[model samples]
Target: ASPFRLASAGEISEVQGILRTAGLLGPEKRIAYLGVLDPARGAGSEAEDRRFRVFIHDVSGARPQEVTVSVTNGTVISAVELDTAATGELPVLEEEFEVVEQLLATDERWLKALAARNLDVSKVRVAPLSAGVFEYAEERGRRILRGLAFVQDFPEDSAWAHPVDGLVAYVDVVSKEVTRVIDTGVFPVPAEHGNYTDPELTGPLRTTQKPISITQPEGPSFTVTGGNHIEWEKWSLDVGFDVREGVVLHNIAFRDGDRLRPIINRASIAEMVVPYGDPSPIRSWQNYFDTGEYLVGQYANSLELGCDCLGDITYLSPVISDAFGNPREIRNGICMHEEDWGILAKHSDLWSGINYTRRNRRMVISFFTTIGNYDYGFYWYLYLDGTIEFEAKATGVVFTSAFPEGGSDNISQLAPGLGAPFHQHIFSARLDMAIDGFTNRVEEEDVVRQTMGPGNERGNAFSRKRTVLTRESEAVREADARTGRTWIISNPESKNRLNEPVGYKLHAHNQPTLLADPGSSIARRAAFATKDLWVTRYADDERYPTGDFVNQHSGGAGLPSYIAQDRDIDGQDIVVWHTFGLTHFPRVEDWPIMPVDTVGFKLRPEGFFDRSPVLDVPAN
Candidate 1:
């Protein structure tokens, strides 16, 4: 079987047809989403390993039921029934049918909603149509899809602040009706309005502004092969996508001497958790797993030249399946580019009047995902210094609850009449670590201060504590910047010239951890985000940190379920799950649009190499 081939347009249609013909996809049933199931451990002779995991939301049943269909080359392999929806990805058509036509078009509740603003649907400019998730379950109520509206479109050069006048519209997907309307009596009019995106916003910047550019002088040394495959310096990787976990990278290896030493088998954003602080039913339940609930790759947009990326860009089309199970070729969905990282470091030899300075270079492969008002950009940075940095940047707007001190009965709010409430956006990068060339053991290295009663008694001293994690039950650790705590994945058999074991270090800073009570529902749903670090025995099936089906999932799953056995993991193949997040407390300045707040963990090199990897680079 072909290794990791993406499902094509023809294959998606064929798979859908086979399910329909088999009496699976009935009148009220449709494909929730579909993607590859990935081949098993090794190889197979037939077109056997290549299979599709098709999730169907069957409405024909008394209640909603999730059906899983496994197909191989237009042939049905297996069909199983599930309890909840197959996947949590928002249906591609729900925006139009539920929001625009059903809710906004006509409804007594929604009509009276904006009537106070002296406007109808035609009079008001609906802000580019974005949706939010509310409560769902047969036990609770109908699935509500929420949206925000703007008064008008502003200019580009001016400060583009879409004035969301405390109005929220909710629609029921199953009923196709506007169930509730929220009008926060307090109109959150910005103190200084009309700050449009005009040149006046940027000192009269021109429509065709002077381009500040960065060039490679000659040409780039890197070469992209077979589209998504990239080879730069000692780095090589194959890029792909998963239905739940987006931007899947495979077979990451380095060209070390006469061999291709492995780094990691795969890499991707397994789960994106953002748990809000407000306690209301709608507000408290705002914890969303971007990967499990709403897949990121499908919302990934095409990149623009000279703007989104620098230099002569090499773009790859990431073929992903929609909720409709149709193949979508997101042109320029992924960008591979080389960037100038300025001067790394320098020193001057005054004795010989000689100075040596070198510029840094990096290979960055990135993609972006817009989950409602928030936009998250995931970056994989490969530097000449033999280090890969996994980072995520958060932009877009804030998820506002009705801030109604004036009308407490009508809407809910964290603060009386103004504040949009506080929330924490948590994320975890699922790293299958292979130090040097193999899956290694993990340890927590800490820097602790020494007391004055020690030998020599200087007192201004510190000691190191590196406790090797021998078991799964005790491997979990949190980030402590003061103590300089870091989790290390090391290969015990391999050692550098200094005799230290070859390894990579994981560290997270710049933000707070989840604040919800450990027993709270918010904390229970996304247990992985509760800690900053987690080390486990590597398993392919354990891809997601927040359960496979988190759309309407109650709890459990994630790291908790994986480590239940407490398997001995000493010197064995292992995986590291690092969780980090930002506690968002909104201010007046944060209104309109919030400036990007970056929160991500770092996977840097320890004693992985004998010497500096990029010291031989030609000096400018």
Candidate 2:
């Protein structure tokens, strides 16, 4: 009998090798495969495990198709097709040919001049004029063409499309040659869309809070208190501790009957502390147990006070909490507070002054806060309309590392072992948080932002500024044992590594929460009854790091697999942390100056909302 009765090592290795050679198991392409049902494994064998479907891109033509290959069975499972004609699901378009056409048509003078010159519009190719073109144009005519463009007869194989824009006149892919050139016009946004809404300004926010206003001191303004000569705008709230004052304050600025009311009050702000020198399993177990209770208690209190009284709040913490209860030390912890609080926190982090515009109802909040060893801070926006937008700016060195050849060894010991190694690999961070109304109902809406890809690296490090908007309905639930809510994330543009924008929906609903004691069946039953749903898109763009990167684990090798026999295998990691429930509810004390606390947004609200809502204040 072979040492491995299921399959010989040679056979398994052959299969893996074939997949790897096919570009299905490489650094650029990470795929997970589901196990097929086989009678040889008996009734409930590992063969029944789910696997990720793989599609290999064959760039033989403009579009690629999946090729069939098999090793052990030598049977073709399926034939994949790569179709480039399909515009990706994302809203942004790489090619602005249509927009250019519109621009040309709208310019009567240009159109007449071309017509009078006997120039064929189709023969005249449009391309992105380089920055050098703008500089030269300052000394030359504005209409002078500086770059090559694709003409009517340009070969497809030619690199006719400029690096900045994809507008092509015509080009031969096989023969490198430019056919025609025309004056290029760069429309930052799709010409159809007037302007590219800054991601930092237009992204979704939790609520509509009073706008933040900043004022500069007159005369060569000297540094005020100390540190930076910055000041918080009125109507904003801060939730950090004042080391000098020796107190944690939830500062709020609002109007109290024509009087500018700036209230600075004390609040309990806890950090996520990680107990060092302990195994992740124990740390996770303890962190979950403690943080879960804290979150629940916060929600209970918030509910008791009501949202109207809380006004607005903001929280600053990590998405994961460790055993020690500190914020940034954990794998997945988040800080979520009201809009007012978020604005205040954002302003405080900015070393440079903020630009506040009251007419547009927009507040641009730029801040510098070092996370981990990363000094390059983030600049985000807090709009009065309830949107949180972000953009990354590098101020210092960017840290990055490539994984070792063999991958990490010890990753499966974690509580939720997804099979792959737990540490020592790159793991992409997937942000999954929902927004609930004051009534405690989940809000179904889209948060707008640009998707990140391989070439979007900043400085020497991969930019970690990707944004994901999760749906409340798709959050994990305890009721649906077999299937949870599903989320559809698509990259309509094929500019990234996957050739095509990858689309995948995740449904996980097997979490057992322990009420008090770990071994108690009653606690288990209660835990099992409550389920949390979460889903996020996975990408290998340089801006997006794998889970192993953020967690700083050792095991980081392996193909993307849903079920790993050994949890410790290492490789590029991609995971979505979907959590359900309110992180904090409004309390009476939260009124006037709301306390600084992190709370979970609602995943589902119809199940808990009351019909015929009543307003607390008199209606006009």
Candidate 3:
């Protein structure tokens, strides 16, 4: 069995049972994460390594520790407690929300704030969020969640549409107490119910188009071996899930004739930060690390047959652990199917008056998760022409607050009184490249035009200028749509028929980097978002873009600290970190619920194949 296979429910249970009785786990300890340890590359017998890493939160001591245990031999390998002095915060547990919800009801300040708005605690929902870093004395070095109140008129109401406006309850999860409450000022709550789920509230549904059904009579064109390994067309990859980062792809390779050539070793969305632009006291500190703080995969939606996917679909049910170390299954956490991609190639012979075309299709592996107010879909596509793409779809109810009379520029007036603030959803993708073999070099390709001198007498000479990124510092670059910038991860030793280095080109969309001020707290903590791309030599310990923990982390931990040594990356085992995202300056059309806002990048084979790989497609 491959080491990248997902851990089964029984395997997770066995690891939990062994660690719980190992005497290091305290009575108030909770399991934050449990996943199979990624095996070392140069180590002996990586496929035979049967070890798992467990993160435990010792709530009583306000400390979290990590333990490594081997399931094959039923032995605990090592246990190391993290130093809180180093400023580390673990993932927030699901049970902490219920604890904060109950604890907020007992607080006099929160109750008084709600009473002033003529509402009871039952009419409001408290969203316990990661308390971001600040210089405040009480919030420093504390295990707390900044509880924000939203108006929930009923159980089925969309709480996001009606924010309670100017109050925050700081509740400590470890002590089960509300340490402080900040009520900046009182503002009118939005009175409209933005519940799209209710038929009465949303008027009537329109039926303009006729029924369109997708079906494959013979079945899908893909197969799942054992459980997580998938094979489609000439592509084969292993699927793995995590409690922190959602769907991860491993051993992605393409079969060219007799040999299977590796492309990416492992790939996943490392981290994403959503920072609100409004400077109001209630929203000033609202920069969120959704993937790190919330453990996004733990809240994956159990996909259905027709609604979530259509046609012949295959699903992989993933197992995740709760706070009490109990494993529960997220039914249909991953969906796999094939999609018709219009056309692969088309040609028309003018002289012969003949036309030829080939239909295109792709294998889609995707999953969706909800983090409070937003729903995100991570979609990975594999095209027949040797192209891979990762698209992030963001759609859900917009987070809103009360609009002012003068209409502030910081927000969009979705309704008469409902205002949605501006924000940026910055995502970081980790690509561990394995082009040809392991050693690879990154090149920045930009189109440049001549100045009409000796080379360009007719003033029409323009060519691509290539620059090899030799070090970590030089590889930190941004997308240049002006010059048509693209990145090439090429293996110097492997050459095509034309004697060119075989490589894959990364086509990054010219997306904006983090809009935060250079001196702001978010810019310091999430420094990886400031640049569009960063390339480094591969190291197993440097997996996350935001270091190991990001809940209340101060600064200088992830990519900023990783490249301080500035090692050589000319022709080494390299990894590329791309930061791309959406800057949502909202409009009225995006009210109630937003349509899916999609952003992504593509990887196309450049000189990797000697000729068109899909030319053998049979005509229908």
Name the top TM-score candidate.
Answer: 3
Better of 1 and 3 by lDDT: 3
Which residue runs of candidate 2 sit more than 4 Å off their true CA positions? Answer: 1-236, 241-358, 361-373, 384-395, 398-438, 445-620
| lDDT-best of 2 and 3 | 3
Best by lDDT: 3
Ranking by lDDT: 3, 1, 2
Instruction: At residue 12, give the lDDT of candidate 2.
Output: 36
TM-score of each model, paired residue for residue: 0.84, 0.20, 0.98
Residue 296 lDDT in candidate 3? 84
lDDT of 1 by residue, 478-589 (tens): 7788888888888988888888888888767836778888877657678888888888887767877876666645566678989887987788878888887777776665
Q: When superposed on Cα atoms, how far off is each prediction in RMSD?
A: 4.6, 28.5, 1.4
Candidates' C-alpha lDDT? 0.67, 0.25, 0.87
Q: Going through the candidates in order, what is the number of backbone clashes in each?
A: 8, 85, 0
How many pairs in model 2 have backbone atoms within 3 A of each other, for residues 3 or more apart or on separate chains, i.e. clashes?
A: 85
lDDT of the structure predicted as candidate 3: 0.87
lDDT per residue (tens digit) for residues 1-620 in model 3: 76777888888888878887887555778888777878788745544767888888887865678888998888999888787547577778887877777899989888898898898788788887787887677666678788888888888888888888888878877877788889988888888878887899677888787877999999998989868999999999999999889999998999999999999988999999999999888878888888888978998999999888887899999988777767799999899999999988999998999899999999999999998888999999999999999999999888787887798879889987888889999999999999987889999999997898886788998889889999897889988999999999999999999999999999998899999899988998899999999998898789888888788888878898888869899889999999999999888878788888899999999999999999888785
